[PDB]
């Protein structure tokens, strides 16, 4: 049964990845075909840029503002900055905004989504001047709603670009993220690429390639059928028409009789999906964000994301009937995402309980081969040799995403720490206990048996491969070869500041 299980797991994990690669290539081909027909100096869409932030890094916030102002798009209405502030510690961002754009920081005493008159004209009069609002701290959804209302009060605005306060945009990011809206009339949202620039630590270095894979391959596969499940927070274009009709249900959201304060962009893309509309993904709109370098902060972030995913997967599954064919792909992806977690958990439990050295070695070898193939494709697509670091993302997944998923599932059905990391510590202790039990139960040496020789040689080779990859990473870190070209210049400017 071990051979059947391992072969089934390998075919299940691969194959789908190959199909996703093919679909992403087709989506990129279609995007290139659309772009090649674009006229030069095309600015037919009038957009408004909305930025929402809460106590951001003043250096990175200034970099984001300057990257927005240094864009080469010829049709920009104005910049709408919303700060979840109104307090003394939050004027440090208003000062940055005044340094970059102007002294138009309006400070209303009310949150627009909690007032009787939610029209944007209640807190702003002139629609031509770039605006900054210092709103009382409620959340990201409230700041986004205020930005939506300030953008929709201009009758000439057709679309909106949503970026984070730590997102550094390329010069053509806005154009490349708003162009696909004008190709198909049924397209209402576009998702750009998000790239990790602080690839200096090992965790961030692995998360950068996880981001690359998850955006490019997966979102391209989704965009071939125009059913992208989540629009990236750091960069996303929305139609004002869909915004004006999904902003209220998305802001007055209650799940199991309580307010929802996570998955702000996942729920927005969901609301777009459940109305039968289409979302695409463009690899040519690129914005740079960063990743957590600490494991525990990453675990909290992944717990939040897993909570959002658990909340939204049922609505995504239930809204698949109004897409017809190519909505079958959405349901298949949802079922695959559901089944993958249980497949990994069951495989780990079965292999651990039945302490067979052949099964363990075969499983680790198959997993290593699969991630080697995936990293080879990633290196081919990115034209970068550092994409082979992705072979070590299995450790990050096993030790961070499974605890986060289990914690989110348990939450959705001293105590503050026990509600965040108790399950993670239990999982780590269980993995250590399983390893110790296997080592103790398989404590013998027999070089006259070719099966024992095979198992020992395989496990030793896997350990040597992991050590070689780690040594290569350390060498690259010492010489700063792992540094993203944006990271080097960011460090250089921050030194002179």
């Amino acid at each position, epitope marked *: 049964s071990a051979v059947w299980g391992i072969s089934v797991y390998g075919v299940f994990v691969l194959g789908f990845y190959i199909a996703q690669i093919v679909f992403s290539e087709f989506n990129r081909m279609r995007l290139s075909d659309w772009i090649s027909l674009r006229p030069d*100096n095309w600015n037919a869409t009038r957009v408004a840029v909305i930025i929402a932030g809460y106590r951001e890094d003043p250096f990175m916030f200034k970099k984001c503002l*300057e990257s927005v*102002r*240094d*864009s*080469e798009y*010829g049709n*920009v*209405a*104005r910049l709408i900055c919303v700060i979840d502030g109104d307090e003394e510690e939050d004027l440090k961002m208003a000062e940055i905004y005044k340094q*970059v*754009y*102007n002294d*138009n920081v309006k400070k209303p005493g009310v949150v627009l989504c909690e007032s009787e008159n939610k029209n944007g004209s209640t807190i702003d009069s002139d629609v*031509s*001047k*770039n605006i900054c609002i210092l709103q009382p701290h409620r959340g990201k959804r409230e700041s986004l709603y205020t930005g939506f209302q300030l953008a929709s009060m201009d009758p000439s605005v057709h679309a909106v670009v949503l970026i984070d306060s730590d997102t550094v945009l390329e*010069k053509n990011a806005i154009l490349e993220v708003v162009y696909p809206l004008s190709c198909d009339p049924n397209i209402k949202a576009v998702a750009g690429e998000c790239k990790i620039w602080n690839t200096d630590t090992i965790l961030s270095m692995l998360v950068s390639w996880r981001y690359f894979s998850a955006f490019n391959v997966e979102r391209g596969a989704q965009s071939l059928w125009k059913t992208v499940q989540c629009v990236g927070g750091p960069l996303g274009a929305y139609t004002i028409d869909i915004i004006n009709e999904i902003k209220d249900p998305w802001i007055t959201q209650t799940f199991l009789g309580n307010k929802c304060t996570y998955g702000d962009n996942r729920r927005l893309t969901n609301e777009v999906l459940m109305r039968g509309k289409k979302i695409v993904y463009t690899p040519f709109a690129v914005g740079w964000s960063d990743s957590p370098t600490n494991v525990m902060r990453y675990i909290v972030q992944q717990t939040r994301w897993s909570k959002s995913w658990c909340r939204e997967i049922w609505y995504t599954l239930g809204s698949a009937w109004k897409h017809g064919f190519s909505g079958i792909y959405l349901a298949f992806e949802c079922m695959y995402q559901i089944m993958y977690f249980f497949l990994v958990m069951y495989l780990f439990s079965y292999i651990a309980i039945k302490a067979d050295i052949r099964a363990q070695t075969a499983t680790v070898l198959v997993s290593t081969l699969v991630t080697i193939i995936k990293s080879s494709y990633l290196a081919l697509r990115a034209k970068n040799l550092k994409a082979f670091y992705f072979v070590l993302y299995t450790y990050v997944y096993f030790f961070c995403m499974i605890p986060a998923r289990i914690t989110a599932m348990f939450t959705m059905f001293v105590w503050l720490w026990a509600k965040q990391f108790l399950i993670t510590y239990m999982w780590w202790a269980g993995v250590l206990a399983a390893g110790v039990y296997s080592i103790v139960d398989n404590w013998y040496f027999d070089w006259a048996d070719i099966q024992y020789r095979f198992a020992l040689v395989g496990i030793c080779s896997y350990l040597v491969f992991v050590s070689i990859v780690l040594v290569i990473y350390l060498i690259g870190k010492i010489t700063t070869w792992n540094y993203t070209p944006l990271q080097k210049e960011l460090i250089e400017e921050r030194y002179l500041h």
Partner: nanobody
Amino acid sequence: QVQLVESGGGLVQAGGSLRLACAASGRIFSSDTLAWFRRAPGKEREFVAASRWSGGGTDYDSVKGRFTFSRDNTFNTMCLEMNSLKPEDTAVYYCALRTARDSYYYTRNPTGYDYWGQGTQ
């Protein structure tokens, strides 16, 4: 932040071409609007040309065809090439910059340009 210096002020007897150069010190964003204005003796500042640090090169006024506006972001300078100069086309040429800081709206009003250069010819 930005200092504009003009060069190329010569004498043309209404039968030759001329080139004017504007060099800018300080960071210029791609959303800024750079313009050439004209001020004749006993005459106000009249618009001549304008464009962005990216492209578009519109609003050539009534001198369309004669004058060409070409930028160079690598050298942080731009130029205006003048062809078929006329006796009426003698004045002092000004280099002006407008920031998208307050608003992104495009205007030809000289009051909207917050950075100016020196004279020329």
